[PDB]
Design an enzyme around this catalytic site. Sequence first.
Site, PDB file in Angstrom:
ATOM      1  N   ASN D 375      -2.125   1.378   2.850  1.00 50.44           N
ATOM      2  CA  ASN D 375      -1.590   1.382   1.502  1.00 50.44           C
ATOM      3  C   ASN D 375      -2.099   2.603   0.739  1.00 50.44           C
ATOM      4  O   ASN D 375      -2.715   3.510   1.304  1.00 50.44           O
ATOM      5  CB  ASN D 375      -1.947   0.075   0.791  1.00 50.44           C
ATOM      6  CG  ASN D 375      -3.426  -0.056   0.516  1.00 50.44           C
ATOM      7  OD1 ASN D 375      -4.256   0.196   1.388  1.00 50.44           O
ATOM      8  ND2 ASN D 375      -3.766  -0.452  -0.702  1.00 50.44           N
ATOM      9  N   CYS D 377      -4.474   2.747  -1.372  1.00 52.99           N
ATOM     10  CA  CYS D 377      -5.929   2.753  -1.394  1.00 52.99           C
ATOM     11  C   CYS D 377      -6.537   2.657  -0.002  1.00 52.99           C
ATOM     12  O   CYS D 377      -7.762   2.574   0.119  1.00 52.99           O
ATOM     13  CB  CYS D 377      -6.448   1.613  -2.273  1.00 52.99           C
ATOM     14  SG  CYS D 377      -5.691   1.530  -3.912  1.00 52.99           S
ATOM     15  N   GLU D 379      -6.768   0.355   2.302  1.00 59.84           N
ATOM     16  CA  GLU D 379      -7.503  -0.842   2.681  1.00 59.84           C
ATOM     17  C   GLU D 379      -6.612  -1.965   3.188  1.00 59.84           C
ATOM     18  O   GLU D 379      -7.130  -2.918   3.781  1.00 59.84           O
ATOM     19  CB  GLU D 379      -8.355  -1.354   1.506  1.00 59.84           C
ATOM     20  CG  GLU D 379      -7.810  -2.566   0.767  1.00 59.84           C
ATOM     21  CD  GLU D 379      -6.746  -2.207  -0.244  1.00 59.84           C
ATOM     22  OE1 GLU D 379      -6.615  -1.011  -0.567  1.00 59.84           O
ATOM     23  OE2 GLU D 379      -6.053  -3.124  -0.728  1.00 59.84           O
TER      24      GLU D 379
END
Lengths: 289, 289, 683, 683
Positions: D375, D377, D379
């Site tokens: 994604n 970020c 994670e």
Amino acid sequence: DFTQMFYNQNVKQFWLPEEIALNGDLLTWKYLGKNEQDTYMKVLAGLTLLDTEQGNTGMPIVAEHVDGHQRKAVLNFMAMMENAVHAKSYSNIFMTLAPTETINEVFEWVKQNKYLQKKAQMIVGLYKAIQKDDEISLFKAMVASVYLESFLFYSGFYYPLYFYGQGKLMQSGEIINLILRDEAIHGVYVGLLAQEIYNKQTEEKKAELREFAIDLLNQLYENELEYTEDLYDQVGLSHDVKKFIRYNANKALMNLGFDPYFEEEDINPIVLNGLKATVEPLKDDDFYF
Amino acid sequence: DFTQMFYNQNVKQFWLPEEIALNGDLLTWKYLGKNEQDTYMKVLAGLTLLDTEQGNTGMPIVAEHVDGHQRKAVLNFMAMMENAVHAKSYSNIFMTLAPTETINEVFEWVKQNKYLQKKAQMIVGLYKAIQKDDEISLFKAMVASVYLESFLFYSGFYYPLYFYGQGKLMQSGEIINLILRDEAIHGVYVGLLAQEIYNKQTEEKKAELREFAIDLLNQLYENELEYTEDLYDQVGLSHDVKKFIRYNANKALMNLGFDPYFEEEDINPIVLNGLKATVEPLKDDDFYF
Amino acid sequence: VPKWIQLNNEIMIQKDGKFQFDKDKEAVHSYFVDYINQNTVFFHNLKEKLDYLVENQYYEEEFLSLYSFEDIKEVFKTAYAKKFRFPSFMSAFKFYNDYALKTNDKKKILERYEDRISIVALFFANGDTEKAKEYVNLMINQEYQPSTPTFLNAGRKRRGELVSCFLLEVNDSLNDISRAIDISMQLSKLGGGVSLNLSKLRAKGEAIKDVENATKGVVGVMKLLDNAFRYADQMGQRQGSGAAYLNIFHRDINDFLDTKKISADEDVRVKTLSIGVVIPDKFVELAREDKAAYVFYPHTIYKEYGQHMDEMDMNEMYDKFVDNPRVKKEKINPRKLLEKLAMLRSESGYPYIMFQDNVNKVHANNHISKVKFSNLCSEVLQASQVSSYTDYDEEDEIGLDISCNLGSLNILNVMEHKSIEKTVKLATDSLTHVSETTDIRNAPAVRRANKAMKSIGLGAMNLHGYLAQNGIAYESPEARDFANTFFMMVNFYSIQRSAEIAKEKGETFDQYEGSTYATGEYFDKYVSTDFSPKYEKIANLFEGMHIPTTEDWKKLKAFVAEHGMYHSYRLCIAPTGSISYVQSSTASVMPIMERIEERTYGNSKTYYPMPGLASNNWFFYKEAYDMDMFKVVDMIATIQQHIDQGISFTLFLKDTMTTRDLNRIDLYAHHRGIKTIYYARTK
Amino acid sequence: VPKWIQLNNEIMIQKDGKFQFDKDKEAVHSYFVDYINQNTVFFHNLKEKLDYLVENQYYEEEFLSLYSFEDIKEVFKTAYAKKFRFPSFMSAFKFYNDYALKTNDKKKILERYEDRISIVALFFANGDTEKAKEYVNLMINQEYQPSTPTFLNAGRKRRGELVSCFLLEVNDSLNDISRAIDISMQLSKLGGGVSLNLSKLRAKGEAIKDVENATKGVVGVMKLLDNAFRYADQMGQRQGSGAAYLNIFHRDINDFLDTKKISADEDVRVKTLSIGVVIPDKFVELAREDKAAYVFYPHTIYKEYGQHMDEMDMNEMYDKFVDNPRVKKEKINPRKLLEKLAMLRSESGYPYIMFQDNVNKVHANNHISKVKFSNLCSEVLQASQVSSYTDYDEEDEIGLDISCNLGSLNILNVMEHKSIEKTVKLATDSLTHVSETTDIRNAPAVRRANKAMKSIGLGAMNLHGYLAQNGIAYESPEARDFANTFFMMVNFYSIQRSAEIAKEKGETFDQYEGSTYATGEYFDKYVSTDFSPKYEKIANLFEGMHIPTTEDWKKLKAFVAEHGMYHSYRLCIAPTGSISYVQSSTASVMPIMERIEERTYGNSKTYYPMPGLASNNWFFYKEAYDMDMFKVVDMIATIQQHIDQGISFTLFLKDTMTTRDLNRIDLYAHHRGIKTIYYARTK
Ligand SMILES: Nc1ncnc2c1ncn2[C@@H]1O[C@H](COP(=O)(O)OP(=O)(O)OP(=O)(O)O)[C@@H](O)[C@H]1O
Ligand SMILES: Nc1ncnc2c1ncn2[C@@H]1O[C@H](COP(=O)(O)OP(=O)(O)OP(=O)(O)O)[C@@H](O)[C@H]1O
Ligand SMILES: Cc1cn([C@H]2C[C@H](O)[C@@H](COP(=O)(O)OP(=O)(O)OP(=O)(O)O)O2)c(=O)[nH]c1=O
Ligand SMILES: [Mg+2]
Ligand SMILES: [Mg+2]
Ligand SMILES: [Mn+2]
Ligand SMILES: [Mn+2]
Ligand SMILES: [Mn+2]
Ligand SMILES: [Mn+2]
């Protein structure tokens, strides 16, 4: 009788390298041999050096010593073109075609190249020797400037023109043609100013000035031969380029009002093939017919 | 950190006098009183005379002493705008509004005028005092240049902007607005070059340079007040012009990285309406732990 | 340098103070003796050629299977019996470089001119050998020329769509904007030029779900569309071309226009997106009276009235918008906006100008919709209905998106053959066939409007060529008289063919009953005004051809009333860029830009004189820039009075004239009934 | 300057050589006694407040209608009974500036911290008063923190979506590319960060239906997505953030990376779209052996094998790709590519690094699909199936597009309350509710994946805060032992809650039967290895709590085998950027960037000390840049062994270290099992 028309011509020729998209040369560049790319980079680097000094030093210093606001405006405009337009355009070409390390290396190469240093030493020395109210020192610097504009650039111009004429590197070539178009008018203009000073002299003084001009040309020429061989032997073109620089030396002499010095020769035909609106407000009567 | 950005902004602001048709100004010029026409002529001549000093001396002298190829190119471009664009633009405005004999007389008057001369010669004096390889004298000249670009012009710009904001003399007002927009960026750029020198100095030397800048500002400001009354009392505008001078003095100081000197004031609304980490190759055994 | 190129460059070499025009003919011979015949693939018989082209995925099997091989051979023999010869080198060069079918390796020529014409005729006829021979005689006489998409792609398996002008309506929603981007990409993939109407989109600083100052305006949508058109560039062959149209009363109109300024930043300027401005009569009235105008926020108008700003008549709605406190608006100076338009057109030729009321006062299908915008070439003017593209797993409301079918009559060849009626009817039949055979599966509104409206565009070209070769100045009243008569006959026979097709198929275009054709209003000026030539020279030009009179127009009106009309739109005059070379014709109805044009192909120079140019007609081939633009406007209005759609009308300006002159030309065009202004080309 | 601003700035004014941390507390008091209490809107009772918030379109009335007003009053009283006080000025400031509900004109404060927590709890419970009180106690104790979308938007009428991140698979087609652009704009409109896998798109110079060198590659799609995210920028409030992920074996991988070079041209540079690189173990093996690698053209591989390049294992198919003449490939230096990655991360912090084999060697749902990208970020690591978006009027094959709901455990508050089990189960229930009430009508694959996968993300915050406040160095082995035990407990109770939800609802996630949860493989390391603390200090820290042993894990494995699991994915450790301020917690499991951070708000400057920073724990709050990145990698791997999805692992680098040090850190992370690397932030 001429400054106003040169003013108009110079300002109407105004351009920026960003007007020309360079990504179209990417493939014809990729396809050149390592020798060809090396010579091309070095050639443009030599040109960059000349324009750097013509813009930083040559044109501003001549502007300082020439009388008349209109003459100064033309010379100031030409100075701007040298360093703000011409010298910068070469970096646009370099940044498109070459990786940073090759760019760094070629600029290091200009600093250590003995022929390029010698020609800069000679030309800039004459610029910096100009003495206020001394027309003879000014004439000598104007001869040097004409030789830079109309002779010295041409060992460099040969190669982009040679490619342009074969349908190769045509976007870079378009930039170079614009630069060349500018230098041609710069050489004529400075030539006319030099002739003004020459025409004020006694016959004896004129004879000495011709000696100066011819001695300087020969000295620059001999250095340019070695520079040309150094760059072009690896691409097999040195003899051809030499013919081209002699051709242009004659044009420089002519810009100074002197007879041609070298005999005519056949130039590579490839290289020869290488060569806002006014606003009025709307009246109420313009809406009726 | 800034020269390439200013290069971009400068070249994209390029313009030519011919782009604005001036003749339609005669349709509002004919309706002004004698005092209004007189003030306008005198202001215009004041701006013209000061801008000529900047084109012939101010910009070229700074370009000469500043180190850096890219800075010299930007400075050359600015000098070009003064001599090739601004000077022709002022001449065009004059030739449109006054007959030849009237232009010659206004320039004779303004050339003899005590307040115009005082400021013109103060600025020119600092340009003439620059010494080779002395950054202190260069800084002092840069301060003078910023004061001209960002402050001294504005007692003059007031009037064309005042008319422009009222719908009068719109063609010449458009020209003046383009000129003013160039002088603004010139002032900001030279200001950054001055701050660079200032920041290289000791604390005692800095305090001394600050005192120089404030003292110079005070001398120029007191003369501006007299200049202002001399020109604008006859058209009843001096109070508002004085507010505009102080507001622009504060901008000039901010260009030099200094605090504002004058309290904040509102400006005449008519004039407002006118206005790389080190690359180290992987050595193997960096894949094993 | 090749021999034909030397023979072509020998034109400029003057002998006895005259250009060697005839040398061009020799060049053609060389171009065929040295290059074309050497690189043309030859087969033992046409059967082998057709088998090789079909098997190697050059042609389509479906259209060839409708004929027996004897019929196809007869059509090819009819094409080759003309013994057609290109009169100029550039005609053959343009055909064999742009339209002739080449092998996958692009080194051999598979199609001659006769082969391509025969294939296009067989595709047009759809199984009728006699109709195919009629089409072959039409195209080999060069009386009619299918557009570049149709001419290039007809009968070819590896091809784009035969339609390249697409007009899209974009509704004021993110779903509709994304769908418009997708459809623009799909149509550019097909090779078509896409025009999008952005007037329904709410301006910058409008509310999204009742949060203020949220909308990016039409400029962000233009950036998205410009990126989409850059991405979809015909598989990296041509630069993706798109157009955006905004109403001049949209508030973003300045920012819209600011997208074409040179000083615009990188986040403002769109480079591959053409822009057009729609100017209602209200804006011209406001500028004329110098009253300050108002540019409105479209979403506030939509919230107040339930309809989009561009969907209602601004002439009757402007005062109500201004007096409505719930409608948000910004003060502008219409004369300043006109000067900005003129300045932008001087700098870059943008925007295109659409005079909305000039289009809609003669629009026959105002009941369906008023013409809100034009195409990328600013000559397609049709009714369009916006589509409501909803969320996923929700049924969309499919509207009408314009996609007309292009094809141009060669006025010189048509009139020298005295075949206005036959050429117009055959061209109408071919355009109907191409419209019926067009099926776009990624543009729902385009497909629906193609099925319903059945709109075609029949254009004309070689007007200036015909006039110059007949000793008539383009600006002369005789030229306008000829244009009036010729295009009235073209309109008459186009309407007659449309009504005949409607009678034969038993169907008209959707919502025809509300059109002015059904009510007979369209024929009013035709049943009262006689359009026969007023000059003896033009009448002698029309000798041998029946000129429809007022009685003939009354009979046609009765025929349309009884049987209807198959096409919602029939005539539109496209620029005709490269097909004018192959046909040896001047481009569109525009005057010629240059008498002899110099072009650079590869590293070689080439020279194209205008067709039929000689010493006798050198003066009559006046260049467009030297002409008075008011008389060009007069001629274009004379033609436009007989064209239901618009005409691609490029202004030709000198560098001396200012923005006041450009604005005067635009205002005279608006006064004279000009529907669209295409370009402002400065010499 | 405000009084609380002066009190907060008084922290840095040292007294007796020590920071005045207690002054911070005073600031909060000022911030409440001078700003918050005056700017708050008080009602006579809770009934008037709820009615005003409901009728004025502040709150959704549906979730409040499930409770009688007595129950809502009891929930609010439970929230206010804790007498929660913000211990730092920045916590209250961040809540009341970013998360507290304000009026339409944003002049007054309508929601206190207790009001927001009560509303979120009532939304979570879905009609259960006791469950609402449990959520209130969980959030007012600050044991659990819903993500910024959920915490900010729960129960609000003007809310966006509660899902933070969305992951889209883009198929190699123009229809799929346009649909991906549309879905990206729709999800950015909803406020979520969108990640797109561009590895299936064919590289530059590929064929679009037999015409070669036609594709623009992933860079053109990158430009389209960048413009789409620029246009859809949360109504101009938060800049539209997108992520593009490309496999390192894609031919465009260099051009991809060249989008983030600071010297990139405007036609290539992309500035609002984050970039991530997916590195299989094959690339690391090739770089380690210094053998020249090959990047591949995806379309040739798809033509030859029928599957996408990223759809199969490169570790077993790379040699087949290289030896296959029908597969097109380009030679690259894998070590030079690694050095380019390190240089790019030093210059700009991009790309994100996803070690594909590290993700998929412990991925529990490889049967559904392998994890091919992460994604925004880096994670979220879940199985995704690409969608086949077909032409209009054709049915689309809807795949699985990843989307999970974020929620973070506050480690300090969870362990202080000795409530790992209760907090984990309640957070799992809240995330399940957020998933169940999420319905996105413009992203079909996202909706289908949310309905089928039922994936949630349960993160953790205040790891470094808990360790420093308990006298444990973040780099110490004791800290890694604590992380091992705590996150094994979190995983155990998350699996237990997922199985209990599956039992109570009688349904598991789609295709659970093929997962390693169903086969019992997932529990292998949990039924053979004991994760109880190895240090006495950590064991004392875990006193009062039943640490699961191998027998408890065996019982949980049997329970899962009998009942299944409701959630395909349960744990993902998000960065938790701004909501960590409100909870008085260090961001995520990352070490603190600075002990006291100076942030400029308006014209004022504020200093936020790390939570619990003091003289006795000053050196336990070691700054991340001063830490050994290898020991941080060890910590992140220790946590990652118990997290089914990834962890947003930001690298904290010094300016002195070279790109070789960054490459060494990346290779050690790959060696230690790190799934993803988020950022390379240089001091
Ligand atoms: N101007 C032209 N336009 C088109 N095709 C031409 C032209 N000139 C020559 N060709 C082509 O070259 C062939 C040779 O034509 P040429 O002028 O030599 O005499 P011909 O009597 O027409 O020859 P043929 O026996 O081929 O019919 C023509 O048949 C035709 O295919
Ligand atoms: N740090 C804080 N966090 C949250 N709310 C606070 C904070 N400081 C003050 N307040 C709010 O401002 C009010 C001011 O009261 P204060 O904390 O000074 O004590 P009080 O008047 O004795 O009452 P109490 O502490 O019992 O609320 C508090 O009741 C509370 O609503
Ligand atoms: C239309 C188009 C496609 N592409 C690329 C991007 C897509 O990932 C890829 C696939 O396009 P498709 O939409 O799949 O084109 P196609 O189906 O007609 O061709 P094919 O049968 O070979 O699949 O082509 C471009 O780069 N530019 C374009 O203009
Ligand atoms: Mg809507
Ligand atoms: Mg496909
Ligand atoms: Mn030069
Ligand atoms: Mn020069
Ligand atoms: Mn100036
Ligand atoms: Mn200046």
